Write a protein that binds this DNA or RNA. Structure first.
Ligand SMILES: [Zn+2]
Lengths: 44, 53, 53, 96, 112
RNA sequence: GACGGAAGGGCACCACCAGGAGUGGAGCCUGCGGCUUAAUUUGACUCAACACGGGGAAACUCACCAGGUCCAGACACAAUAAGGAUUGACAGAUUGAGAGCUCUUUCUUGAUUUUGUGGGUGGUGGUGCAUGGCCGUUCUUAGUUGGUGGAGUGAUUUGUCUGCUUAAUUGCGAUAACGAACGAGACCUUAACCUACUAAAUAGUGGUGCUAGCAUUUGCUGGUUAUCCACUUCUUAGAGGGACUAUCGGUUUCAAGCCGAUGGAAGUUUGAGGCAAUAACAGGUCUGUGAUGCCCUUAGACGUUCUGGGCCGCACGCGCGCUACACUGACGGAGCCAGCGAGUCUAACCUUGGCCGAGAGGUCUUGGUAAUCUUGUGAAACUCCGUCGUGCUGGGGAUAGAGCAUUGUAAUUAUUGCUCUUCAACGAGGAAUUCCUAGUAAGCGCAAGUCAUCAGCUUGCGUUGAUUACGUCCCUGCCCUUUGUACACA
């Protein structure tokens, strides 16, 4: 079953689609915010 | 079928409820209906008025 | 952890269950009773059904 | 039963305003009547209270009947912050 | 309305059966000898034929108020459209239900 | 007490007689064994298992199988833990799979959980040989008990019986018995009678009026739920009435009764049911029940959810059925009449009517929450006219082929329906065995239950409507008494 790998204190600027209630991502330039399930493709 | 399970001689219960309906046609004014319908209330016998004739 | 799966149960035996028993089998749907054959015999005189013949 | 603090406060605020809860046992019933939340949430929030604490449960014809006791109102008012002499069916509210 | 009388009498017949079994499960310890439902304009009066009413009512009509709200929210009645009364049991000794429950309690209290 | 191939008296179409209609033969449907299988879930095996579990499974039901999640792990306690217990997630991978079920990315969250330890819940898991309840059966027959008294050392006995009646321990009676209770009867529902009451635009009818057609004189056959009058024959449900073997004759000590005739709607307890004793079974059901003891599991779940599969699998055997083997018939036309049902509101019911269609079935409206509409459910057998002429034939319609629809998330292992083609066995059924005495058997269909769809099933109802008994212990069992017994789980 799931472990949920725990990361210490977080940590960038405001998120694109929702309010400032999340952080933008460290991926293959594929920003993918999970409050509003996902709607960004660029470096916004 | 009487038995809760399948086993036993095939005996059958025929429970029969009765419903009797009655039909009254008065030529009352507005005066009487607001007293006659408010009175004559009995348990087990439910009465409805079709006061739109 | 998706939507708790519950796929169409809107007809046949496993759509509706006995009003009291929660049984799928031996229902009386007649006159919208929705009571199991056994449960119904227990609550026969309660609802009004009594045997004459 | 990881019920949001909002979703559990809703049923506690309800049980305060009413003093009575009736819930059809039918689990995964998208929403309950008189409470704007899921059904298994109402059943298991009041089961989590009845089994250990401060509320009583009766079952009849696939319907839970939850009624509140005097230990009910006392514990649930330290939860919810009300003074005393409350609105549920504990005493006289209407001309009855 | 509109629901057929053929069906509707059976519908409120089953209401009586569910009521009888609800009070036969809950108010069986304070005695119980059946219920009565009188249907009135703007009112349906359910009267409990139970024994000691000083506990059936509860205190100050607390318990009966809690039974009224229970039976109301069950069948989604509007507050005031249904009332709960508590009658006395006419010659308790004939109530076969009251003798059965009282004996059941005697047998659960460790008695031969 | 039980048994007897021992006796006596009576009784039963779950016995026989006299017959009738069958099943057993044939094809198919359906249940059960068996074999197979991933599993073909499971209960019941004489009467009292096998169209039974209201058990007509496409999923659900579902208990069985291959494989998935999830917690719905109440609480109580100890831990990590706000320099996060823990939650969920788009996207590739992963898989029946928009499954974050698990992996990579790394965000969302914020005390609700989660990790051990007790403790609990659920369980169509096990035990009907732990039980409750309910049911079937012994047992459709008439049988069973306690008070007081009598007999007996006691278990027990008499009451509860020789005889004669009865459907009957029903009675007349005789009497260590007297006086009682239960069961039978009574009771209740129902189906028949009511030129009598009480009323009916949710039932009819006879009248007038607006009229249609044939006639011509007045007369016939119709239409008009919003044209009025009247009653109650028909129809409906209320209160009642009538039948008690009534009267007469027989006939038994002329007692209870029974037999015959007459009258009467009715003369079998008037027909049919419901209710139904004491005692009993190690009868069935723990798979109807938040009915339940105990036992087993409790998350890699034996909980309930999802996908698909199976309950339908076929050398074979058995039980209820359906269709038939035709001329007392088939087919085509026309003729053309029931009864008991049931039926939708925030839902998709019964569905007129008009159009499309060879169908099946579609469309656009419509009446009915119903003595108002479906509906006169103008059902089938049946009736008449005609086409087949003793042939596996046009009887029979099984198997198969292709197509068109409907229900349903889903029709393949063909749901059902419909069209055309394919035409099998079956020439009245061996040894056996079932049910039946009058509006009954039998033929005929109809409505209701499950039901989205599926009846060859059941529960009911009318349609048509016999033959043959009106009896007796020969078989199979029953009840009472006598008797024998080495039996008493008899
Ligand atoms: Zn977002």
């Amino acid at each position: 079953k799931h472990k949920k790998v725990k990361l210490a204190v977080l940590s960038r600027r405001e998120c694109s689609n929702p309010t400032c209630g999340a952080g933008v991502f460290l991926a293959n330039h594929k920003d993918r915010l999970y409050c509003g399930k996902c709607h960004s493709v660029y470096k916004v | 079928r009487k038995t809760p399970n399948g086993e036993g001689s095939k005996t059958w219960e025929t429970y029969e409820m009765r419903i009797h309906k009655r039909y009254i046609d008065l030529e009352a004014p507005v005066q009487i209906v607001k007293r006659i319908t408010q009175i004559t209330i009995e348990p087990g016998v439910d009465v409805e008025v079709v006061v739109a004739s | 952890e998706n939507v708790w799966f519950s796929h169409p149960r809107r007809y046949g035996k496993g759509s509706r269950q006995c009003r009291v028993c929660s049984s799928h089998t031996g229902l009386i749907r007649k006159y919208g009773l929705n009571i199991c054959r056994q449960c119904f015999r227990e609550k026969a005189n309660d609802i009004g059904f009594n045997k004459f013949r | 039963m990881l019920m949001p603090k909002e979703d559990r406060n809703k049923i506690h605020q309800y049980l305060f305003q009413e003093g009575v809860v009736v819930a059809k046992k039918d689990f995964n019933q998208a929403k309950h009547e008189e409470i704007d939340t899921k059904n298994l949430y109402v059943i298991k929030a009041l089961q989590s209270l009845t089994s250990k604490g401060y509320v009583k449960t009766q079952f009849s014809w696939q319907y839970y009947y939850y009624t509140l006791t005097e230990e009910g109102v006392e514990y649930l008012r330290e939860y919810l912050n009300l003074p005393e002499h409350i609105v549920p069916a504990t005493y006289i509210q209407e001309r009855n | 309305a509109l629901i057929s009388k053929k069906r509707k009498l059976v519908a409120d017949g089953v209401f009586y059966a569910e009521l009888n079994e609800f009070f036969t499960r809950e108010l069986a310890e304070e005695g119980y000898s059946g219920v009565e439902v009188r249907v009135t304009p703007t009112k349906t009066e359910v009267i409990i034929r139970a024994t000691r009413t000083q506990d059936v009512l509860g205190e100050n009509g607390r318990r009966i108020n809690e039974l009224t709200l229970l039976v109301q929210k069950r069948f989604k009645y509007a507050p005031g459209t249904i009332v709960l009364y508590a009658e006395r049991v006419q010659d308790r000794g004939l109530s076969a239900v009251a003798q059965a429950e009282s004996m059941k309690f005697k047998l659960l209290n460790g008695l031969a």
